[PDB]
Amino acid sequence: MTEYKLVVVGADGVGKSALTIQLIQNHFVDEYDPTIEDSYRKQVVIDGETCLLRILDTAGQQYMRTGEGFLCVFAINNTKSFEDIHHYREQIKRVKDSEDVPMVLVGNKCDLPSRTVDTKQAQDLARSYGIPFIETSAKTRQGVDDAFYTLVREIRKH
Ligand SMILES: Nc1nc2c(ncn2[C@@H]2O[C@H](COP(=O)(O)OP(=O)(O)O)[C@@H](O)[C@H]2O)c(=O)[nH]1
C-alpha cells in the first residue's frame, strides 16, 4: 500500500503532539511530554484511498531526510511560534536540499479566544512560501483532517 511519511515541525508548545494524537488516536491530550519524539502510524482513506501514514512527531530533545511532507505548526495565541516559522522552513530546505518540499502551514488552537496571529497574516506568509495554510484545533478536531490530507495531496502533486 502507498505509505506517506509526514513530519510535524514547529516551536514547542504549539500542539505538535496533540495534532498527531487527535489524528491517530482520535482524542485530545492535555499534556504530552515535550521530549517524546516518536513515529505514529495509521491507515487512512484520503478522498477515498487506502494510504499508510507514518507520522514523525518532532521535539526539541526518527529520520527527517526521509520525510516527504512537512506540516509547519504554530499556535494562533503564540506570536513567538509564528515568528519562528521561518527557521523551520529553512531547516526543511537544508535537510532536503530543495526549495520544492511539499509543505503545509498550520495555525493550531484556533478554539482559543486570546488570538494574536491574524488569518491574513498567516495567509501572507503562506503565499510567501507557495504552500497552503490551514487553521486547526487539536481540541475540537477542526481542520485537523484537512491539515494532514492536504499535505498528502501536496505530496501527490510533487
Ligand atoms: N485549546 C487548545 N489547546 C491545544 C491545542 N493543541 C494543543 N493544545 C495544548 O497545548 C499544549 C502543548 O501541546 P503539545 O502537543 O504538547 O505541544 P508540542 O508537542 O510541543 O508542539 C498541550 O497541553 C495541549 O493540550 C488546540 O488545538 N487547542
Ligand SMILES: [Mg+2]
Ligand atoms: Mg511535544
